[PDB]
């Protein structure tokens, strides 16, 4: 009884494209224009985040073909740095990182799908919270049903969001095809470029939010048909498509609206639909919701597979990583993902957790790529189907260390709170993992609740 590989090349392309293109292309440009000052600085920030994500994806393709086991970015750290940093990464990546990232996109889905009923108006908040929870519950039920159904969902919604962005891009092209330019003058487009790199790296963070999810096919390997070919071929095909669409969508945004027209706007896609369309301008918020639906589906998929792999190393309870026969899906891991995602619906503002934890999110990537170089030098007895040129990982490590050291130099009050939450897992590691020889007051109860959840969900252990 195993997980029964189904992911094709086009399924992996759809997974990466649908998970990356979520909400950030419709929310973040105001935050980038606020910190860049000039539109040209915004476009070079978007292109820089694009090239940065492409370089990191090449390094993760080389890592995922080297080690080639599931649960990427956590198994790669467990292979090199032992058990305790892997558990700390798994702890943080569970608790704060995965349900908040899913709940943000679900909330943007619910907010933008209810915009035609409240055109010039704030949406009622609890209706949006309920619709977001409905989205999460429907998608986890679809994921608990079958894997082929979930890949069909991801395929359809990735194609839908691609055609939506193509429509927006061609509208921005026919606007500049009407012989005059609002923005994009060769001397005006750079007027307003502020400075103070400390006020530039915040625009870099706001752009790097929209590129999140670029390493999720590394989480969902061990289920790909022929991974040694179809993982880097999926990454190479997928991520250059995102950067081009992002810079063309920002360019189409700028030739409809002026600068402080966008700096004081609430939904720059809704205003774009209001300009180029009369009635039938609800198409654009409908399509934004359809993008965020597929992004939530892909993130739920990869999170369930990550907790599946983390249970197999003895770092999580063993009720997880139990497969249900005749469906062959990790049902308790999916239930555990959905429960946490619904649990983060009690916060009023959850966007202020991104700056609390960005330093750890890039520290783990930098640690994994340092471990990749150290593994290539220390242990050269592995088969490597792709081998990147060096000084791409070295430049990526230098850029990640630049982002970490700058985030400890402009806003050091949130990183301290983040580092305080990180070491709270250190009591948890020494209860369950390291502390064996537990009393019989605890082992029988854990066995009883495990077999009770087994009898409820009809799940067997893995082994095949």
């Amino acid at each position: 009884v195993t997980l029964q590989r189904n992911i094709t090349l086009l399924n992996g392309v759809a997974i990466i494209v649908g998970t990356i293109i979520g909400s950030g292309i419709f929310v973040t440009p105001t935050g980038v224009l606020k910190e860049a000052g000039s539109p040209g600085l915004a476009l070079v920030v978007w292109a820089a985040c694009g090239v940065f994500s492409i370089v990191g994806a090449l390094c993760y393709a080389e890592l995922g073909t080297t080690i080639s086991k599931s649960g990427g970015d956590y198994a790669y750290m467990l292979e090199v740095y032992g058990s305790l940093p892997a558990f700390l990464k798994l702890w943080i990546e569970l608790l704060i990182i995965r349900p908040s990232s899913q709940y943000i996109v679900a909330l943007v889905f619910a907010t933008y799908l209810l915009k035609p009923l409240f055109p010039t108006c704030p949406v009622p908040e609890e209706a949006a919270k309920l619709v977001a929870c409905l989205c999460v519950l429907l998608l986890t039920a679809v994921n608990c049903y079958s894997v082929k159904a979930a890949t069909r969902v991801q395929d359809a919604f990735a194609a839908a969001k691609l055609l939506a962005l193509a429509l927006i891009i061609l509208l921005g092209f026919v606007q500049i095809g009407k012989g005059d330019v609002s923005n994009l003058d060769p001397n005006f487009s750079f007027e307003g470029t502020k400075l103070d790199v400390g006020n530039i790296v915040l625009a870099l963070y706001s752009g790097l939010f929209a590129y999140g999810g670029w390493n999720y096919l590394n989480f969902v390997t061990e289920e790909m048909i022929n991974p040694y070919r179809n993982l880097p071929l999926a990454i190479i095909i997928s991520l250059p498509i995102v950067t081009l669409v992002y810079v063309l969508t920002n360019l189409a945004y700028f030739t409809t609206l002026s600068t402080e027209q966008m700096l004081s706007s609430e939904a720059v896609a809704v205003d774009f639909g209001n300009y180029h369309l009369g009635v039938m301008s609800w198409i654009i918020p409908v399509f934004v919701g359809l993008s965020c639906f597929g992004s939530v589906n892909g993130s739920l998929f990869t999170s369930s597979r990550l907790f599946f792999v983390g249970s197999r190393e003895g770092h999580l309870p063993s009720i997880l990583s139990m497969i249900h026969p005749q469906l062959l899906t990790p049902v308790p891991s999916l239930v555990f993902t959905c429960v946490m995602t619904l649990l983060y619906a009690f916060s009023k503002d959850i966007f202020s957790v991104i700056n609390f934890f960005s330093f750890f999110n890039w520290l783990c990537v930098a640690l994994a790529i340092i471990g990749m170089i150290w593994l290539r030098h220390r242990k050269p007895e592995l088969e490597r189907p792709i081998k990147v040129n060096l000084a791409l990982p070295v430049f990526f490590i230098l850029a990640c260390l630049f982002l970490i050291a700058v985030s400890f130099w402009k806003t050091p009050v949130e990183c301290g709170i983040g580092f305080t939450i990180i070491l709270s897992g250190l009591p948890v590691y020494f209860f369950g993992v390291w502390w064996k020889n537990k009393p019989k007051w605890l082992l029988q109860g854990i066995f009883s609740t495990t077999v009770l959840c087994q009898k409820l969900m009809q799940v067997v252990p893995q082994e095949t």
């Binding site: 055109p119 010039t120 009622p124 039920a141 009720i319 252990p461």
Partner: protein, 471 residues
């Protein structure tokens, strides 16, 4: 495996009847809970009240107009042509004005009626081509151009006292000519000297609207009587009218409050224009200690504020030696006023006041962007209410956006506010703690919330508190 059972044990234990019924019951219970959450979202969505529909504003609803009567005195000598006016459009874009009432640039010799022509440009301003370039240059800066078509602007009687018909006949062709040229509106001043006045403005308004619905017509009187204004506003309602209705008085605040509220009552809460005159500065009617209070008042009343050139720096005509009061020299820099060198100062000029945060130009710029951006100041609702003996307090509120509260002290003693609201609608009732956005006088720090119970005001102070939609 490690803390659980295996395949066969579970398949022969958890296959018994009851357990199958338990998991099917939990499945249908899950789907009924999902449908219950869907119904709970739907009945919350339909219970939300609705949201109001926007009034489809014009371009002159979204900011202030700027009157430049004498083009020679705006730039200065040697550059008083139409071409030099193109160089000031970046300064005019810093004031965020939406329109521009250029003075009468047509060829008028003197009180002879046969020689003047409203179709031709006077050669001391330029020609038609540098006017067409000016229109296209202002069109790129999002600034509209209104042309004053008052015929006899060099003379005492402004409408050619001899007869009335032919001088009103040439205006009819001038409207169609200059609308084809591409102007955005017209202005006619001194219509109290026009015989059969109310039945000519309707015809000119008809032609101006029949070209397009985005065309303006402004009329100007020197009247202060309310009934003479309403008589001109009987058959016309989309006509903008500038008068001397507020230039009368206002030593006390209850006079200005009654003057605003009686006009809004007798008109019917229609769209109006707020000014102090038709071609005069603010310093021609107010002392220098009331120039901030009236600038705070005119930017927050429900209408279009109209200003003359130099009202943002407090350009006083009587505060200098020999000079006409109809065309003072605009003080761009310190070297503006050429003769008597050493009469201007640093706080009297544009560039000297363009750096000081506690200046008058800074107050004008801080009001003129709030007027053109905030939704409850563009087409919001107005409500005045009773206050302390000498105050003027009112509230602007549109639907669910940020509510604005303005408090003004038109007197020379320190007053406590005492905002006994007691008559506002329940939608826009007062909160307990309102914020602060600006103040006319220095000695307040901006951004921290006060509370409107022990609210104390020093003389000639004005407050622009704000508070959000709540319950």
């Amino acid at each position: 495996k490690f803390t659980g059972l295996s395949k066969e044990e579970l398949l022969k234990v958890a296959g018994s009847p009851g357990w199958v019924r338990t998991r099917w019951a939990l499945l249908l219970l899950f789907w009924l809970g999902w449908l219950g959450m869907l119904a709970g979202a739907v009945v919350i969505i339909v219970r939300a009240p609705r949201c109001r529909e926007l009034p489809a504003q014009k371009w002159w609803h979204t900011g202030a107009l700027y009157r430049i009567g004498d083009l020679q005195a705006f730039q200065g000598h040697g550059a008083g042509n139409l071409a030099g006016l193109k160089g000031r459009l970046d300064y005019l874009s810093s004031l965020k004005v939406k329109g521009l009432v250029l003075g009468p640039i047509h060829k008028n010799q003197k009180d002879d009626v046969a020689q003047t022509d409203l179709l031709q440009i006077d050669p001391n301003f330029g020609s038609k081509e540098d006017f067409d370039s000016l229109l296209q240059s202002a069109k790129k800066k999002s600034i509209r151009v209104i042309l004053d078509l008052t015929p006899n602007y060099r003379g005492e009687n402004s409408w050619f006292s001899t007869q009335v018909d032919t001088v009103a006949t040439k205006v009819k062709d001038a409207l169609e000519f200059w609308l084809q040229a591409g102007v955005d509106g017209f202005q006619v001043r001194d219509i109290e000297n026009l015989k059969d006045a109310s039945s000519f403005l309707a015809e000119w308004q008809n032609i101006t609207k029949g070209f397009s619905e985005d065309r303006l017509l402004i009329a100007g009187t020197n009247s202060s009587d309310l009934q003479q204004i309403l008589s001109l506003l009987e058959s016309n309602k989309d006509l903008l009218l500038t008068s001397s209705y507020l230039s009368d008085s206002g030593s006390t605040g209850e006079h200005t409050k009654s003057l605003v509220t009686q006009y809004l009552n007798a008109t019917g809460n229609r769209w109006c224009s707020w000014s102090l005159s038709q071609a005069r500065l603010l310093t021609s009617f107010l002392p220098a200690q009331l120039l901030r209070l009236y600038q705070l008042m005119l930017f927050t009343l429900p209408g279009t504020p109209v200003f003359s050139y130099g009202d943002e720096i407090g350009l006083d005509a009587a505060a200098l030696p020999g000079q006409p009061m109809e065309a003072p020299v605009m003080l761009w820099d310190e070297s503006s006023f050429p003769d008597i060198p050493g009469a201007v100062s640093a706080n009297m000029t544009v560039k000297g006041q363009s750096e000081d945060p506690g200046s008058l130009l800074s107050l004008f710029r801080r009001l003129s962007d709030q007027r053109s951006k905030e939704r409850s100041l563009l087409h919001g609702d107005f409500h005045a209410f009773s206050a302390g003996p000498g105050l003027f307090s009112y509230i602007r509120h549109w639907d669910q956006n940020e509510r604005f509260l303005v408090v003004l002290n038109f007197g020379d003693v320190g007053l406590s506010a005492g905002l006994q609201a007691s008559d506002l609608p329940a939608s826009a009732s007062l909160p307990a703690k309102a914020d602060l956005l600006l103040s006319t006088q220095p000695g307040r720090e901006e951004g921290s919330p006060l509370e409107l119970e022990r609210l104390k005001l020093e003389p000639h102070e004005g407050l622009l508190l704000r508070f959000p939609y709540a319950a």
